[PDB]
């Protein structure tokens, strides 16, 4: 059950540079005061990443998923709720669905009949200062399901936080030999629209052995007002980083070997 959001203006893919964001823990191993090099899928430093402008402004387009993906979200109030990953997205084959609502981060794995416009309904804004899930307008049927997962109950604030983006949410997705990975991290920031300059680490969240093939992914009934959102989409390719661990197991600095000759020498 879905309703198309056709009152959408096409926006050019405006470009912005991700300075030093997207570095995470590739493997669950602790090593102290050493410089370990790794060859996996990572987001390049200072790379031209697509910056999306969301207000009016909510385009929900299909994007290809190849060699992993990146996500960053300079957000207030967590308008971002999840993503999907699959190869057909038309109930023919199993596809991944990640839904984060006010109660649980639920994982459902079925041959989802993915409708063109996936979105979740919330109590509009008439006069009442209340916000919670109303519409499951993401898919229609889930016939042959294989994997499900629900975290422990918690309540997340759906209140319409205003102002500059205070909470930084950066999420990384990959698929290796059927295993599905999601990584996350929360940190404060004070800046207007762009990504800050600085170094940070992204912690692992949960590993899921789904084993389905993925090639493309996607992030009264007409007319809605959305809070100002600035999220980004990056793509990952096999690259070599020089990760500097401290004696505590927390990353302090990283260098992309493939950026410039100075990086190659380092």
């Amino acid at each position: 059950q879905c309703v198309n959001l056709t009152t959408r203006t096409q926006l050019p893919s405006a470009y912005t540079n991700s300075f030093t964001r997207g570095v995470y823990y590739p493997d669950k191993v602790f090593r102290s005061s050493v410089l370990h090099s790794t060859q996996d899928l990572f987001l390049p430093f200072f790379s031209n990443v697509t910056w999306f402008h969301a207000i009016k402004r909510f385009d929900n387009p299909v994007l290809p998923f190849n060699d992993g993906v990146y996500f960053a979200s300079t957000e207030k109030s967590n308008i971002i709720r999840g993503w999907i990953f699959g190869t057909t997205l038309d109930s023919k084959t199993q596809s991944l669905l990640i839904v984060n609502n006010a109660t649980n981060a639920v994982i459902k794995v079925c041959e989802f009949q993915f409708c063109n416009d996936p979105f979740l309904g919330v109590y509009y804004h008439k006069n009442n200062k209340s916000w919670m899930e109303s519409e499951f307008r993401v898919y229609s049927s889930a016939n042959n399901c294989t994997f499900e997962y629900v975290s422990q109950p918690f309540l997340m604030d759906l209140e319409g936080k205003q102002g500059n983006f205070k909470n930084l949410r950066e999420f990384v997705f990959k698929n290796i030999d059927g295993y599905f990975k999601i990584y996350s991290k929360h940190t404060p920031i004070n800046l207007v629209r762009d990504l800050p300059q600085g170094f940070s680490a992204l912690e692992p969240l949960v590993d899921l052995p789904i084993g389905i093939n993925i090639t493309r992914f996607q992030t009264s009934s007409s007319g809605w007002t959305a809070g100002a959102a600035a999220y980004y989409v990056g793509y990952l390719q096999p690259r070599t980083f020089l990760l500097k661990y401290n004696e505590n197991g927390t990353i302090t600095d990283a260098v992309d070997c493939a950026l410039d000759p100075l990086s190659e020498t380092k």
Binding site: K28, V29, F30, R31, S32, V34, C145, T146, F147, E148, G178, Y179, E203, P204, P209, I210, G211, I212, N248, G249, T250
Partner: protein, 360 residues
């Protein structure tokens, strides 16, 4: 024997290296708990019938077959793909569990590659069946004195359908060439007839509840399978540990390192395992293999005498009897008498110590 001669010269000889053999082997794994309720299926209030046998999803649980098999309430138990004992180790991507009740005389139709009414009309099996067929008598529970007419079976079907094909067609069957119309008429037969189970019925006529655990192999990550175990932890003696597949030999000692909550292992610049975290009770431990070192034989000439002494290269002699004493930085020497007068070096040992043949 090493020098391949009956006469050995004055000097120090390195032969027959030494290693402290580990005492025994220890196994450690995390906690295993999530059991899906086979109880509510096996002890279920009412089972489905053979005409519309139900299929139910078994997901993300432990398939502990020990309690499943050791129960004596079952009548027959036949696995056709693997040995019944070893289902607990080979993990299954998915398991198809069906519960159905038939006559005792029809149980030989359940076996694959057989001829029978329920083998051909509703429940057919492929020529490469792999699951396990389990049945148990339930006369005293299913039977009714007036006839328990709840169960139904396919008396007539238009054709023999494929294995594991479930259908709900109940239209009046056409036995003859003339078409059938209405509910009754010539060549008009009801495709469903009702089972009647009575206490007076003997073996073969009794109601027998049957369950089959069939499974599909390696088209998705493993989801449901049997249990696993671990033993008590020990310290201060080199043993063969197994932490989530981390086979190795070494002494177990409490350490001062501090992991992150999700961190599991430890590695050095040498890229080797150095610290492991217990998956049951969170602690940080060191791994250092128990001591090893070459054995050195110190002797004068064969003609002069026969007495010798043995040295352990870099080995502590607090643990020497595994194979007069004196401790040196190069190792611990036994069989020699220590003195204090200082002479010229006769045969070198290491760390400034030199042995000699002297007075008797």
């Amino acid at each position: 024997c090493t020098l391949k001669s009956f006469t050995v010269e004055k000097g120090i000889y390195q032969t027959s290296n030494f290693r402290v053999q580990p005492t025994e082997s220890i196994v450690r794994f995390p906690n295993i708990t999530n059991l899906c309720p086979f109880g509510e299926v096996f002890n279920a209030t009412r089972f489905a019938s053979v005409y519309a046998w139900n299929r139910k999803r078994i997901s993300n649980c432990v398939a502990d077959y020990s309690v499943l098999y050791n129960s004596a309430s079952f009548s027959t138990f036949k696995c056709y793909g693997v040995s019944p004992t070893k289902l607990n180790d080979l993990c299954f991507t998915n398991v198809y569990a069906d519960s159905f009740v038939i006559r005792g005389d029809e149980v030989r139709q359940i076996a694959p590659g057989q001829t029978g009414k329920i083998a051909d009309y509703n429940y057919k099996l492929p020529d490469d069946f792999t699951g396990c067929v389990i049945a148990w008598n339930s006369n005293n529970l299913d039977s009714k004195v007036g006839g328990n007419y709840n169960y139904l079976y396919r008396l007539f079907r238009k054709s023999n359908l494929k294995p594991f094909e479930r259908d709900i067609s109940t239209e009046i069957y056409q036995a003859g060439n003339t078409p059938c119309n209405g509910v009754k008429g010539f060549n008009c037969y009801f495709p469903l007839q009702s089972y009647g189970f009575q206490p007076t019925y003997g073996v073969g006529y009794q109601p027998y509840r049957v369950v089959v655990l069939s499974f599909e192999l390696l088209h998705a990550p493993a989801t449901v399978c049997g249990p696993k175990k671990s033993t008590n932890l020990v310290k201060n003696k080199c043993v063969n540990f197994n932490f989530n597949g981390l086979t190795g030999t070494g002494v177990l000692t409490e350490s001062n390192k501090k992991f992150l909550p999700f961190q599991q292992f430890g590695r050095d610049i040498a890229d080797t395992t150095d610290a492991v975290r217990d998956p049951q009770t969170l602690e940080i431990l060191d791994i250092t293999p128990c001591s090893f070192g070459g054995v050195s034989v110190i002797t004068p000439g064969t003609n002069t005498s026969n007495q010798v002494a043995v040295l352990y290269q870099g080995v502590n002699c607090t643990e020497v009897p595994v194979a007069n004493v004196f401790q040196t930085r190069a190792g611990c020497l036994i069989g020699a008498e220590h003195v204090n007068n200082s002479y010229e070096c006769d045969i070198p040992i290491g760390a400034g110590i030199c042995a000699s043949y002297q007075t008797s």
